[PDB]
């Protein structure tokens, strides 16, 4: 079982040692994304509903409808501050502090720091990595490379079936975990490498597909019963 960063990072992984896949801010920014919509999809945050009348998604503030500790160290980070943080803050907001975009010395003590040795600790524990320390020639590192081929291969697929063969003309009919990672993947740039190992013609259609996807618009679309809120306004602060 993994979580949305986890699948956001997989994907951007290319090779098994990953000297040839890097880190930006896109991705960076895009995990944030990943954090929000995961404590969202497990009832810890919802927007507030108060005044929608006149508001956005993009307007509307993050509520903590429940602290209970989730068992990811960064959910549990990053769900901690937006329990203590208040008056409450909207999505934008929210990537923004927890990612460190900001200079003021009150909101530092809100970004979350070493994203990427837990994350890979975390996919370590699962046993998605490995751990090589290495002595290279020219100096000493620890890499992670990837030893459960398996799980990276069955993500892959996963993610070229749902805009290939499993689609279907309707987005809502289709599993929110997926929707909101294919989203997140193109947000942080990782999702092209799910499609480049596909033939010309798959390829074309995937992209086709992805970008009516990208039409959409969160503020018709977060109006259908029984969907996420939360999930579009993070769609909508990345388009």
Not at 73 to 95: F, G
Request: with cysteine.
């Amino acid at each position: 079982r993994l979580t949305l960063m986890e699948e956001v990072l997989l994907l951007g992984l290319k090779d098994r040692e990953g000297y040839t896949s890097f880190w930006n801010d896109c991705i960076s920014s895009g995990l944030r994304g990943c954090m929000l919509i995961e404590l969202a999809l497990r009832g810890r945050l919802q927007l507030e509903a108060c005044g929608m009348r006149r508001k956005s998604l993009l307007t509307r503030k993050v509520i903590c409808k429940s602290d209970a500790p989730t068992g990811d160290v960064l959910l549990d980070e990053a769900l901690k501050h937006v329990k203590e943080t208040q008056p409450p803050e909207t999505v934008q907001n929210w990537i923004e502090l927890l990612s460190g975009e900001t200079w003021n010395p009150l909101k530092l003590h809100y970004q979350l720091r070493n994203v990427r040795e837990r994350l890979a600790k975390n996919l370590v524990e699962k046993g998605v990595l490995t751990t090589e320390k290495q002595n290279f020639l020219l100096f000493d590192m620890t890499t992670h490379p990837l030893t459960n081929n398996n799980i990276k291969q069955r993500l892959i697929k996963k993610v070229q079936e749902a805009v290939l063969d499993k689609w279907v003309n309707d987005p809502h009919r289709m599993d929110r975990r997926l929707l909101a990672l294919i989203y997140l993947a193109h947000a942080s740039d990782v999702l092209e490498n799910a499609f480049a190992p596909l033939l010309d013609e798959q390829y074309d259609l995937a992209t086709k597909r992805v970008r009516q996807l990208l039409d959409l618009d969160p503020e018709v679309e977060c109006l259908k019963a029984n969907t996420n809120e939360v999930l579009w306004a993070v769609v909508a602060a990345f388009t």
